[PDB]
Design a protein around this ligand. Sequence first.
Ligand SMILES: [Mg+2]
Ligand SMILES: [Mg+2]
Ligand SMILES: [Mg+2]
Ligand SMILES: [Mg+2]
Ligand SMILES: [Mg+2]
Ligand SMILES: [Mg+2]
Ligand SMILES: [Mg+2]
Ligand SMILES: [Mg+2]
Ligand SMILES: [Mg+2]
Ligand SMILES: [Mg+2]
Ligand SMILES: [Mg+2]
Ligand SMILES: [Mg+2]
Ligand SMILES: [Mg+2]
Ligand SMILES: [Mg+2]
Ligand SMILES: [Mg+2]
Ligand SMILES: [Mg+2]
Ligand SMILES: [Mg+2]
Ligand SMILES: [Mg+2]
Ligand SMILES: [Mg+2]
Ligand SMILES: [Mg+2]
Ligand SMILES: [Mg+2]
Ligand SMILES: [Mg+2]
Ligand SMILES: [Mg+2]
Ligand SMILES: [Mg+2]
Ligand SMILES: [Mg+2]
Ligand SMILES: [Mg+2]
Ligand SMILES: [Mg+2]
Ligand SMILES: [Mg+2]
Ligand SMILES: [Mg+2]
Ligand SMILES: [Mg+2]
Ligand SMILES: [Mg+2]
Ligand SMILES: [Mg+2]
Ligand SMILES: [Mg+2]
Ligand SMILES: [Mg+2]
Ligand SMILES: [Mg+2]
Ligand SMILES: [Mg+2]
Ligand SMILES: [Mg+2]
Ligand SMILES: [Mg+2]
Ligand SMILES: [Mg+2]
Ligand SMILES: [Mg+2]
Ligand SMILES: [Mg+2]
Ligand SMILES: [Mg+2]
Ligand SMILES: [Mg+2]
Ligand SMILES: [Mg+2]
Ligand SMILES: [Mg+2]
Ligand SMILES: [Mg+2]
Ligand SMILES: [Mg+2]
Ligand SMILES: [Mg+2]
Ligand SMILES: [Mg+2]
Ligand SMILES: [Mg+2]
Ligand SMILES: [Mg+2]
Ligand SMILES: [Mg+2]
Ligand SMILES: [Mg+2]
Ligand SMILES: [Mg+2]
Ligand SMILES: [Mg+2]
Ligand SMILES: [Mg+2]
Ligand SMILES: [Mg+2]
Ligand SMILES: [Mg+2]
Ligand SMILES: [Mg+2]
Ligand SMILES: [Mg+2]
Ligand SMILES: [Mg+2]
Ligand SMILES: [Mg+2]
Ligand SMILES: [Mg+2]
Ligand SMILES: [Mg+2]
Ligand SMILES: [Mg+2]
Ligand SMILES: [Mg+2]
Ligand SMILES: [Mg+2]
Ligand SMILES: [Mg+2]
Ligand SMILES: [Mg+2]
Ligand SMILES: [Mg+2]
Ligand SMILES: [Mg+2]
Ligand SMILES: [Mg+2]
Ligand SMILES: [Mg+2]
Ligand SMILES: [Mg+2]
Ligand SMILES: [Mg+2]
Ligand SMILES: [Mg+2]
Ligand SMILES: [Mg+2]
Ligand SMILES: [Mg+2]
Ligand SMILES: [Mg+2]
Ligand SMILES: [Mg+2]
Ligand SMILES: [Mg+2]
Ligand SMILES: [Mg+2]
Ligand SMILES: [Mg+2]
Ligand SMILES: [Mg+2]
Ligand SMILES: [Mg+2]
Ligand SMILES: [Mg+2]
Ligand SMILES: [Mg+2]
Ligand SMILES: [Mg+2]
Ligand SMILES: [Mg+2]
Ligand SMILES: [Mg+2]
Ligand SMILES: [Mg+2]
Ligand SMILES: [Mg+2]
Ligand SMILES: [Mg+2]
Ligand SMILES: [Mg+2]
Ligand SMILES: [Mg+2]
Ligand SMILES: [Mg+2]
Ligand SMILES: [Mg+2]
Ligand SMILES: [Mg+2]
Ligand SMILES: [Mg+2]
Ligand SMILES: [Mg+2]
Ligand SMILES: [Mg+2]
Ligand SMILES: [Mg+2]
Ligand SMILES: [Mg+2]
Ligand SMILES: [Mg+2]
Ligand SMILES: [Mg+2]
Ligand SMILES: [Mg+2]
Ligand SMILES: [Mg+2]
Ligand SMILES: [Mg+2]
Ligand SMILES: [Mg+2]
Ligand SMILES: [Mg+2]
Ligand SMILES: [Mg+2]
Ligand SMILES: [Mg+2]
Ligand SMILES: [Mg+2]
Ligand SMILES: [Mg+2]
Ligand SMILES: [Mg+2]
Ligand SMILES: [Mg+2]
Ligand SMILES: [Mg+2]
Ligand SMILES: [Mg+2]
Ligand SMILES: [Mg+2]
Ligand SMILES: [Mg+2]
Ligand SMILES: [Mg+2]
Ligand SMILES: [Mg+2]
Ligand SMILES: [Mg+2]
Ligand SMILES: [Mg+2]
Ligand SMILES: [Mg+2]
Ligand SMILES: [Mg+2]
Ligand SMILES: [Mg+2]
Ligand SMILES: [Mg+2]
Ligand SMILES: [Mg+2]
Ligand SMILES: [Mg+2]
Ligand SMILES: [Mg+2]
Ligand SMILES: [Mg+2]
Ligand SMILES: [Mg+2]
Ligand SMILES: [Mg+2]
Ligand SMILES: [Mg+2]
Ligand SMILES: [Mg+2]
Ligand SMILES: [Mg+2]
Ligand SMILES: [Mg+2]
Ligand SMILES: [Mg+2]
Ligand SMILES: [Mg+2]
Ligand SMILES: [Mg+2]
Ligand SMILES: [Mg+2]
Ligand SMILES: [Mg+2]
Ligand SMILES: [Mg+2]
Ligand SMILES: [Mg+2]
Ligand SMILES: [Mg+2]
Ligand SMILES: [Mg+2]
Ligand SMILES: [Mg+2]
Ligand SMILES: [Mg+2]
Ligand SMILES: [Mg+2]
Ligand SMILES: [Mg+2]
Ligand SMILES: [Mg+2]
Ligand SMILES: [Mg+2]
Ligand SMILES: [Mg+2]
Ligand SMILES: [Mg+2]
Ligand SMILES: [Mg+2]
Lengths: 206, 126, 148, 193
Amino acid sequence: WRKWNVKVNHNEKRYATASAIAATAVASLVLARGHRVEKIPEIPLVVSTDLESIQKTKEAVAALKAVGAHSDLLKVLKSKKLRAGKGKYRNRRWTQRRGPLVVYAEDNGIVKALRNVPGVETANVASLNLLQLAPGAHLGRFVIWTEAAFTKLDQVWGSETVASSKVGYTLPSHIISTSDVTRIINSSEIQSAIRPAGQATQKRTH
Amino acid sequence: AKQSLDVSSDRRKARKAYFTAPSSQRRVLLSAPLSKELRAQYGIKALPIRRDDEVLVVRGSKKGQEGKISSVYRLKFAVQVDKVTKEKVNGASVPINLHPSKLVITKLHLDKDRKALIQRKGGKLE
Amino acid sequence: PSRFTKTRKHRGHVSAGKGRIGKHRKHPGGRGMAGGQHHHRINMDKYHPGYFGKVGMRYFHKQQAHFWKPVLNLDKLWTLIPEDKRDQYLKSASKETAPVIDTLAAGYGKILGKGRIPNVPVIVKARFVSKLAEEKIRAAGGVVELIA
Amino acid sequence: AISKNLPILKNHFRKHWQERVKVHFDQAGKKVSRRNARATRAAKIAPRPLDLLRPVVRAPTVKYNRKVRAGRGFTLAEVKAAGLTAAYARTIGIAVDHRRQNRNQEIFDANVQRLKEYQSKIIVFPRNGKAPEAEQVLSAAATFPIAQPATDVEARAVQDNGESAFRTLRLARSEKKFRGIREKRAREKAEAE
RNA sequence: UUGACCUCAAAUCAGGUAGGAGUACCCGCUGAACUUAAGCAUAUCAAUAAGCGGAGGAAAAGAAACCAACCGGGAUUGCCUUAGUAACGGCGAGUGAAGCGGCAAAAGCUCAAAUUUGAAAUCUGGUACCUUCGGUGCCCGAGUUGUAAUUUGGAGAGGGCAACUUUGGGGCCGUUCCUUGUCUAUGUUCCUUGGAACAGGACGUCAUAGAGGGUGAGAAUCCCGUGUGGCGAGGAGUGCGGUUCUUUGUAAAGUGCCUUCGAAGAGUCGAGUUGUUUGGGAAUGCAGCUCUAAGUGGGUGGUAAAUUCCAUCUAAAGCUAAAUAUUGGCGAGAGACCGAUAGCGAACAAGUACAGUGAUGGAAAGAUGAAAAGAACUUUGAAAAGAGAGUGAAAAAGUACGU
RNA sequence: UAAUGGUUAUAUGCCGCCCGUCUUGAAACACGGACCAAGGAGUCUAACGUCUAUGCGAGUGUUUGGGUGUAAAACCCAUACGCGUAAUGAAAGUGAACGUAGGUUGGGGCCUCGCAAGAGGUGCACAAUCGACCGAUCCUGAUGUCUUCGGAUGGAUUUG
RNA sequence: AUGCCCUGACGAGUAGGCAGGCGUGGAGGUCAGUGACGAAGCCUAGACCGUAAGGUCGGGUCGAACGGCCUCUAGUGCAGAUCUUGGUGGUAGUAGCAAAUAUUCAAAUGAGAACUUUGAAGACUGAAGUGGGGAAAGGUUCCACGUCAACAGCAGUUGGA
Ligand SMILES: [Mg+2]
Ligand SMILES: [Mg+2]
Ligand SMILES: [Mg+2]
Ligand SMILES: [Mg+2]
Ligand SMILES: [Mg+2]
Ligand SMILES: [Mg+2]
Ligand SMILES: [Mg+2]
Ligand SMILES: [Mg+2]
Ligand SMILES: [Mg+2]
Ligand SMILES: [Mg+2]
Ligand SMILES: [Mg+2]
Ligand SMILES: [Mg+2]
Ligand SMILES: [Mg+2]
Ligand SMILES: [Mg+2]
Ligand SMILES: [Mg+2]
Ligand SMILES: [Mg+2]
Ligand SMILES: [Mg+2]
Ligand SMILES: [Mg+2]
Ligand SMILES: [Mg+2]
Ligand SMILES: [Mg+2]
Ligand SMILES: [Mg+2]
Ligand SMILES: [Mg+2]
Ligand SMILES: [Mg+2]
Ligand SMILES: [Mg+2]
Ligand SMILES: [Mg+2]
Ligand SMILES: [Mg+2]
Ligand SMILES: [Mg+2]
Ligand SMILES: [Mg+2]
Ligand SMILES: [Mg+2]
Ligand SMILES: [Mg+2]
Ligand SMILES: [Mg+2]
Ligand SMILES: [Mg+2]
Ligand SMILES: [Mg+2]
Ligand SMILES: [Mg+2]
Ligand SMILES: [Mg+2]
Ligand SMILES: [Mg+2]
Ligand SMILES: [Mg+2]
Ligand SMILES: [Mg+2]
Ligand SMILES: [Mg+2]
Ligand SMILES: [Mg+2]
Ligand SMILES: [Mg+2]
Ligand SMILES: [Mg+2]
Ligand SMILES: [Mg+2]
Ligand SMILES: [Mg+2]
Ligand SMILES: [Mg+2]
Ligand SMILES: [Mg+2]
Ligand SMILES: [Mg+2]
Ligand SMILES: [Mg+2]
Ligand SMILES: [Mg+2]
Ligand SMILES: [Mg+2]
Ligand SMILES: [Mg+2]
Ligand SMILES: [Mg+2]
Ligand SMILES: [Mg+2]
Ligand SMILES: [Mg+2]
Ligand SMILES: [Mg+2]
Ligand SMILES: [Mg+2]
Ligand SMILES: [Mg+2]
Ligand SMILES: [Mg+2]
Ligand SMILES: [Mg+2]
Ligand SMILES: [Mg+2]
Ligand SMILES: [Mg+2]
Ligand SMILES: [Mg+2]
Ligand SMILES: [Mg+2]
Ligand SMILES: [Mg+2]
Ligand SMILES: [Mg+2]
Ligand SMILES: [Mg+2]
Ligand SMILES: [Mg+2]
Ligand SMILES: [Mg+2]
Ligand SMILES: [Mg+2]
Ligand SMILES: [Mg+2]
Ligand SMILES: [Mg+2]
Ligand SMILES: [Mg+2]
Ligand SMILES: [Mg+2]
Ligand SMILES: [Mg+2]
Ligand SMILES: [Mg+2]
Ligand SMILES: [Mg+2]
Ligand SMILES: [Mg+2]
Ligand SMILES: [Mg+2]
Ligand SMILES: [Mg+2]
Ligand SMILES: [Mg+2]
Ligand SMILES: [Mg+2]
Ligand SMILES: [Mg+2]
Ligand SMILES: [Mg+2]
Ligand SMILES: [Mg+2]
Ligand SMILES: [Mg+2]
Ligand SMILES: [Mg+2]
Ligand SMILES: [Mg+2]
Ligand SMILES: [Mg+2]
Ligand SMILES: [Mg+2]
Ligand SMILES: [Mg+2]
Ligand SMILES: [Mg+2]
Ligand SMILES: [Mg+2]
Ligand SMILES: [Mg+2]
Ligand SMILES: [Mg+2]
Ligand SMILES: [Mg+2]
Ligand SMILES: [Mg+2]
Ligand SMILES: [Mg+2]
Ligand SMILES: [Mg+2]
Ligand SMILES: [Mg+2]
Ligand SMILES: [Mg+2]
Ligand SMILES: [Mg+2]
Ligand SMILES: [Mg+2]
Ligand SMILES: [Mg+2]
Ligand SMILES: [Mg+2]
Ligand SMILES: [Mg+2]
Ligand SMILES: [Mg+2]
Ligand SMILES: [Mg+2]
Ligand SMILES: [Mg+2]
Ligand SMILES: [Mg+2]
Ligand SMILES: [Mg+2]
Ligand SMILES: [Mg+2]
Ligand SMILES: [Mg+2]
Ligand SMILES: [Mg+2]
Ligand SMILES: [Mg+2]
Ligand SMILES: [Mg+2]
Ligand SMILES: [Mg+2]
Ligand SMILES: [Mg+2]
Ligand SMILES: [Mg+2]
Ligand SMILES: [Mg+2]
Ligand SMILES: [Mg+2]
Ligand SMILES: [Mg+2]
Ligand SMILES: [Mg+2]
Ligand SMILES: [Mg+2]
Ligand SMILES: [Mg+2]
Ligand SMILES: [Mg+2]
Ligand SMILES: [Mg+2]
Ligand SMILES: [Mg+2]
Ligand SMILES: [Mg+2]
Ligand SMILES: [Mg+2]
Ligand SMILES: [Mg+2]
Ligand SMILES: [Mg+2]
Ligand SMILES: [Mg+2]
Ligand SMILES: [Mg+2]
Ligand SMILES: [Mg+2]
Ligand SMILES: [Mg+2]
Ligand SMILES: [Mg+2]
Ligand SMILES: [Mg+2]
Ligand SMILES: [Mg+2]
Ligand SMILES: [Mg+2]
Ligand SMILES: [Mg+2]
Ligand SMILES: [Mg+2]
Ligand SMILES: [Mg+2]
Ligand SMILES: [Mg+2]
Ligand SMILES: [Mg+2]
Ligand SMILES: [Mg+2]
Ligand SMILES: [Mg+2]
Ligand SMILES: [Mg+2]
Ligand SMILES: [Mg+2]
Ligand SMILES: [Mg+2]
Ligand SMILES: [Mg+2]
Ligand SMILES: [Mg+2]
Ligand SMILES: [Mg+2]
Ligand SMILES: [Mg+2]
Ligand SMILES: [Mg+2]
Ligand SMILES: [Mg+2]
Ligand SMILES: [Mg+2]
């Protein structure tokens, strides 16, 4: 009768999920989290909806290597290690890195085709597990979207013109309008209003 | 990945099921692959191993040696192949235990049950 | 969060934060509410005044649905009209078409007069109202309808 | 002991309560098995819809008499007014309650209408014939839903006669409070001379 | 004399049944104390532990002598809540429900009961033949001190008449399911290290299979499996595609009026007293003793009583699946569990060795090596053994063996 | 480069009583401690106070259940229910704006004039105080009454 | 930019509070981390860093796994408890092995004889026996052959081993 599960507020779960989805955008978080995406042209990586109908593992890995997940797919299966400790004989014998998350809107073979590929996890846009999106509570999973998945995301989480399709839900507000304060500080309205600055290391008088 | 709730990924259970297997289960467990010639001839890849089979060792320190399997020692999970011996210092000759997965069958002992086994696995029997 | 506890910080220090003199024991003042009239009397009167003794008359077999009468105040009272209709009902206020608010259908049993409905006529259906609720509802030009 | 300004607690753990601790670790497993039982039962009672038709009844207890809900069964009188018998209605998916009675014409008409809608929307298969399959819908409750009856329109004319309607509650409370003592006063006036 | 009847016996008479084990959960009886109250006696622990009786895969409960007071719900059970509340309590410590509402599951019924009275229409047994969990015939028996048919309060029965609707069973293969067998992919290619490649590097292949485990060191690809499907085999009171007993048959069951009825459980309900129990308070339930009902009346409607009503059920007889429980048994699958002073007492010939008269108590004890390859042979010594030699990657692994 | 320095052993000078514990007071002629290894003691739960953090906010709480699932995860969800939005009284009950939701005294910040100092204005939070309103208590007792009900209005060193 | 810099003051502490850190088992993530060309462990009056908790390296031994950082979690840190279990000391080659009168010579056996066997001598129990049998209890101890690692508190070639 120890507490094993922990209740989280549903709206705070949705907050964390939405911030995880937003962190699967710009590539600094994806590089800092792991995820060899330095030779990827643009994040989000959205591929065509024909991926969801691929039902061979060989064709699926050809598609992932062709759209650019080759070095991440090689980071997994070269990171397979025997687990340090007593966990290795508690059915937790090998550890490996996380591969890409392939996120789809409808499943026509892609789940089973990418099932056997190490590191690679698949997901429906209807769900989007936070355990998959920010594993180890590190933001910025490498995510390959299909076009249908990317379109359906606007209906699953809402916008300024689509509500949310979750009951009562709105995406969270911002308490600050920009995330980089240096251009607010070097804006002309603050700079013309502030006094001149000093030496930035004071002279040692006396 | 496992898909059925009947088989076990438990390492302890798998090792008890290996080390406490009866001999009729150890016969299947002590399988041995065929050679390139026999795999082309019989269309199948591996068979349970027999006494009068001719084998080539392809691993370990006696690799590349030939012989007939003198004994299938299922209690030790081993096969004893003649011409593959250890000369002791008193002049005695003891058989070296080999595992059949490190062997390659180069000639089968065929009888009616082996022929039916090959045909059951889909073999050409040629 | 076992690693954040002060048990982890009292490791090495003899008494685990409990003192060498007073010397942490099993139950030094009794168990539970023991001695609330003898040695815990000051913690009773000072912080639980009224704790001991009887108060008025008993009710055998009380059902707390003879007493369900949730109270609505007039300061809200237009929340019960949905927001798309609220604007059109308070703009160009009208008798001969006034909103009907069933208060029971929203789950209150009494209307009370906290303050200042606007001057729009309203038909308020209530199980119970107070006098000042009646006075302010009629001063807006409306009516209270008694329902059961 | 008793110490600083804290609420006085009433935790009842002076029995051997640890012999009787049930932790529901099997919540997900019992959900899987309830869904398995629903699927198995559905396959066993193919095309029949896995639950009986229940009537709409008014909930008791003046806290809850503003709501209607699903009751247990239809009322022999309701079954007869719908045009069938109880022993045959129990075989075509209608729950029948012999022990409830109708004293509300609106509830009665709602349940006779509910029964006639059901009898129009079911296909009773022939008893010995070929009986072509009619695509199992798994729930009668989600296809004949319990609707809260509309009691008023959104807007009407203000009809204020100046009765003042707090005075109505005060006077009606006073007549109940003094009905017996002044009925007895009236009869002792009648016992004069 | 003889023939019954009733009651009681006997038999190694014919056939059958009970005991004991297990006992986690279940239905009962019985029943403490430590403890808390900062002492203690009521109280609390606790309607618990121990003790005893009885079941099953669930049990129990269960189709209202219910809840209510509403515009009323509607068998039982369980969860969420009601609620640490109403209430009880040296009104102290403490204790403590229920109705409503939302869900899970849902299922309803059977006797006493009536004159069959122009059919004891009913049933056990034996015997004979079969379609052998049974049927049919015959005979003896049970039984009128009442076995069948009809009826169960929601009703219903008798009679009188416009009237239409519905006929039940038995064997085969696949199929619901259970048990179980079998088949089903891809490198053992090169070089380096090593005793051993399963390591490292290079070139590939399969992947609805990169779970897991073995194999001389981290093996998807060597082996078993895994994944996906196919082919069987042996069984389970059948949802259906065919089969057939076809004067199964003025059967049986429903449904409309009218009329006369409408039987409904006794030392029981209830009452007093005593004791126990309960949150149940001028008595919540149970039990002992005493008193002992009625039939538009009996119970209940949470403050005792008289009077007047009202509301709600219909006890003193009985059956019933599910949702619920389950430190036992069988079979599985898992784990942010423990890792040989831990985890069960027990990883091992562990409830063992051993102690006690006995009830009972109750340990310690895993690891050579990849393979015994477990040290041929020489020499010293009476021998143990030593020194060499030798095996082994290692003897800084030599059975007194990983480190 | 051990030449200076570090480490270590030793010598020398001065200093240095045995730790833990209870205690006013321990080196104590107080108690435990021969030694070493391994084990070994504020935990988990129900309810709750303060504070803090997060989400939403007059609301909030998805996880009892239902749907769904790559399956004890994750995702989605209705009706309820709990707590909050109303108090007070033993209870029957009643139930919160005279006013710009009041006056006064302070009051950050802001506004006006000022080169400042200041002067004025507005003053949220909060503190003090006097009032107003709601309930309980004690009074007063209007219009009506099918005459004993009702309880308007006005009060109070009372009380929440 | 819980960064860097400037200026000033301050620093005792039981019981206790709070903070910032060090370390251990396990979990999620990462370093495509280390490793049979040697992981972990262990030893090391060798070295380096940290005020310290500790961390790092070199050498020896060893043979299969294990680390850093970011988080999560706890059966998480020992000198004590007449603590528990196991092991080992000093005392210490010490106290002791002194009741029941008592042994001795030869030969044989044997590697080895105070103690075995046989001969010889000397003694004792002294028929309410240190004799001959049984009851309870024990359970093969009886007897023969082989044999001495342990046991017979010296020895042993002997033995109820
Ligand atoms: Mg939420
Ligand atoms: Mg493929
Ligand atoms: Mg590894
Ligand atoms: Mg790991
Ligand atoms: Mg581990
Ligand atoms: Mg380990
Ligand atoms: Mg380790
Ligand atoms: Mg395990
Ligand atoms: Mg495993
Ligand atoms: Mg494993
Ligand atoms: Mg926010
Ligand atoms: Mg064969
Ligand atoms: Mg913290
Ligand atoms: Mg200390
Ligand atoms: Mg410390
Ligand atoms: Mg201290
Ligand atoms: Mg403290
Ligand atoms: Mg102490
Ligand atoms: Mg104290
Ligand atoms: Mg204390
Ligand atoms: Mg006193
Ligand atoms: Mg009290
Ligand atoms: Mg009182
Ligand atoms: Mg009272
Ligand atoms: Mg009022
Ligand atoms: Mg205090
Ligand atoms: Mg689920
Ligand atoms: Mg289950
Ligand atoms: Mg169902
Ligand atoms: Mg009604
Ligand atoms: Mg007999
Ligand atoms: Mg028995
Ligand atoms: Mg039990
Ligand atoms: Mg019971
Ligand atoms: Mg106790
Ligand atoms: Mg107590
Ligand atoms: Mg006491
Ligand atoms: Mg005490
Ligand atoms: Mg006391
Ligand atoms: Mg005492
Ligand atoms: Mg009790
Ligand atoms: Mg108990
Ligand atoms: Mg018991
Ligand atoms: Mg007893
Ligand atoms: Mg049984
Ligand atoms: Mg069941
Ligand atoms: Mg039963
Ligand atoms: Mg029963
Ligand atoms: Mg009844
Ligand atoms: Mg009710
Ligand atoms: Mg009723
Ligand atoms: Mg009920
Ligand atoms: Mg419950
Ligand atoms: Mg509730
Ligand atoms: Mg509550
Ligand atoms: Mg009790
Ligand atoms: Mg309910
Ligand atoms: Mg009945
Ligand atoms: Mg090789
Ligand atoms: Mg290697
Ligand atoms: Mg090279
Ligand atoms: Mg091998
Ligand atoms: Mg392997
Ligand atoms: Mg595989
Ligand atoms: Mg595999
Ligand atoms: Mg499979
Ligand atoms: Mg009939
Ligand atoms: Mg009756
Ligand atoms: Mg009687
Ligand atoms: Mg009686
Ligand atoms: Mg009793
Ligand atoms: Mg009691
Ligand atoms: Mg009583
Ligand atoms: Mg009594
Ligand atoms: Mg009463
Ligand atoms: Mg685990
Ligand atoms: Mg160990
Ligand atoms: Mg053990
Ligand atoms: Mg043990
Ligand atoms: Mg054992
Ligand atoms: Mg004894
Ligand atoms: Mg004994
Ligand atoms: Mg060892
Ligand atoms: Mg090896
Ligand atoms: Mg030597
Ligand atoms: Mg060698
Ligand atoms: Mg070695
Ligand atoms: Mg060597
Ligand atoms: Mg050697
Ligand atoms: Mg070694
Ligand atoms: Mg020099
Ligand atoms: Mg030098
Ligand atoms: Mg010196
Ligand atoms: Mg000196
Ligand atoms: Mg000195
Ligand atoms: Mg000196
Ligand atoms: Mg001097
Ligand atoms: Mg000195
Ligand atoms: Mg002490
Ligand atoms: Mg003293
Ligand atoms: Mg002194
Ligand atoms: Mg001291
Ligand atoms: Mg002294
Ligand atoms: Mg002393
Ligand atoms: Mg002492
Ligand atoms: Mg010491
Ligand atoms: Mg001592
Ligand atoms: Mg230790
Ligand atoms: Mg330790
Ligand atoms: Mg301890
Ligand atoms: Mg909720
Ligand atoms: Mg969710
Ligand atoms: Mg009230
Ligand atoms: Mg009053
Ligand atoms: Mg005002
Ligand atoms: Mg006023
Ligand atoms: Mg102010
Ligand atoms: Mg007032
Ligand atoms: Mg008030
Ligand atoms: Mg007042
Ligand atoms: Mg100073
Ligand atoms: Mg200091
Ligand atoms: Mg520090
Ligand atoms: Mg642990
Ligand atoms: Mg760790
Ligand atoms: Mg985990
Ligand atoms: Mg090597
Ligand atoms: Mg090493
Ligand atoms: Mg080691
Ligand atoms: Mg040292
Ligand atoms: Mg060294
Ligand atoms: Mg080794
Ligand atoms: Mg090894
Ligand atoms: Mg390492
Ligand atoms: Mg531990
Ligand atoms: Mg511990
Ligand atoms: Mg210490
Ligand atoms: Mg200490
Ligand atoms: Mg110690
Ligand atoms: Mg000690
Ligand atoms: Mg010990
Ligand atoms: Mg020792
Ligand atoms: Mg000596
Ligand atoms: Mg001596
Ligand atoms: Mg002596
Ligand atoms: Mg002597
Ligand atoms: Mg001699
Ligand atoms: Mg001598
Ligand atoms: Mg002589
Ligand atoms: Mg003599
Ligand atoms: Mg003898
Ligand atoms: Mg001998
Ligand atoms: Mg000796
Ligand atoms: Mg000796
Ligand atoms: Mg001797
Ligand atoms: Mg002997």
